[PDB]
Design a protein around this ligand. Structure first.
Ligand SMILES: CCCCN(C)C(=O)CCCCCCCCCC[C@@H]1Cc2cc(O)ccc2[C@H]2CC[C@]3(C)[C@@H](O)CC[C@H]3[C@H]12
Ligand SMILES: CCCCN(C)C(=O)CCCCCCCCCC[C@@H]1Cc2cc(O)ccc2[C@H]2CC[C@]3(C)[C@@H](O)CC[C@H]3[C@H]12
Ligand code: NI
Ligand code: NI
Ligand code: NI
Ligand code: NI
Lengths: 204, 204
């Protein structure tokens, strides 16, 4: 498979959006957590089908498959949330009809800071002018950077990210730099996922 | 400062080694933890002077300075340990005269698995044929990838890593790939540092 072809299959593998909605009345700690939780449940179902569409993922052992989805699922969700909210300052686009204002974060104890960390990282991706095609490779690298067919798969995604950056036309050095900047941003997603998780544990 | 000049100052900023030694008798949980702990203490002193030699680090606010050293110190220590043990399968080179066999890990409860994670990541760096000059930039990127003079500093280190990879002579695409592989290895160091820390907490 060529890089371009790898990208095209990732593009077609995007999960469908989820059918949700904001309760008409003002959010409460209960209804906001109820909404986020139902949303994630449906996204988690679609995430499994998405990973199965990544070229070579189903050829991995069932155990490795489950292992990857299990250890980086909050990260895959957050980066999708960031991509969706990239062009909307102060807003988190959890789902097409589940758009939350930053200030709504005070509706839940301790979610405000997590919202703020998501908004900041999203702003960095915006400043970097992240492209939708680079978002697809970066998302697949989060799921896979955790040995043999796996390393092969990661390499393929990496060559697909490099091909996408080459098509932007900047210089060779600026292409390396851009690569380094995209990858260093994923470690920020890792950090916010760890805090979001602890935020969940203490909560439920 | 040119990339080459940035590298040369990092090279001269390497901390001096520490004066330590193995107790003559066979290690016990107490004497192994005593040795590791004294070693780290002295390395932690030298780490502070090293960071102060990174071009632009002292111009950062005192608060940011302390913040960086405080959040990624175990990572900077582990990557130095990995570099030192790169050419020695089954051995962790904690210090010139503090060389531990893998099997000595059973001398302390729960250290065996941490030793094993360090040895595995070290083997990956060996397979990648990590160069000492790339090790210097990667180490400085761990300390700095955590806004303005900081971003400037990180960019400078990144351009220094890219310059070092260009001098290896591989193709443009293989240079991007190599960059992506070095950076993805640092996230493994992050993970082992988290486990080593928890291992310490539960312990002391
Ligand atoms: C997909 C395969 C893995 C499935 N496995 C093994 C699992 O364990 C899944 C476990 C399901 C966990 C149920 C809880 C659902 C998570 C909802 C996340 C909830 C909804 C959500 C949705 C997104 O699309 C992105 C981020 C987020 C989270 C960001 C961080 C928040 C704001 C935290 O601060 C509190 C609420 C969290 C948000
Ligand atoms: C430098 C500025 C930061 C200083 N600050 C704010 C601090 O808090 C420093 C705190 C000092 C912590 C004291 C404990 C010393 C750490 C010794 C680490 C101990 C020695 C050591 C030395 C290395 O050069 C590399 C890794 C390592 C660790 C690897 C992971 C191990 C094997 C764990 O599984 C148990 C022992 C750990 C090893
Ligand atoms: Ni569905
Ligand atoms: Ni939009
Ligand atoms: Ni000294
Ligand atoms: Ni050696």
């Amino acid at each position: 498979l060529s890089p371009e072809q790898l990208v095209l299959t990732l593009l077609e593998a995007e999960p469908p959006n989820v059918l949700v909605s904001r309760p008409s009345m003002p959010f409460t700690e209960a209804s906001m957590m109820m909404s986020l939780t139902k949303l994630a449940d449906k996204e988690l179902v679609h995430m499994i089908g998405w990973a199965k569409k990544i070229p070579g993922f189903v050829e991995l052992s069932l155990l490795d498959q489950v292992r990857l989805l299990e250890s980086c699922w909050m990260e895959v969700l957050m980066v999708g949330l960031m991509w969706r909210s990239i062009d909307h300052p102060g807003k988190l686009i959890f789902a097409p009809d589940l758009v939350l204002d930053r200030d709504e974060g005070k509706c839940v104890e301790g979610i405000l800071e997590i919202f703020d960390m998501l908004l900041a990282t999203t702003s960095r991706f915006r400043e970097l002018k992240l492209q939708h095609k680079e978002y697809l490779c970066v998302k697949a690298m989060i799921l896979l950077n955790s040995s043999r067919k796996l390393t092969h798969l990661l390499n393929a995604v990496t060559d697909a990210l490099v091909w996408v950056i080459a098509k932007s036309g900047i210089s060779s050095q600026q292409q390396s730099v851009r690569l380094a900047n995209l990858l260093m941003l994923l470690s920020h997603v890792r950090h916010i996922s760890n805090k979001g998780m602890e935020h969940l544990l203490s909560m439920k």
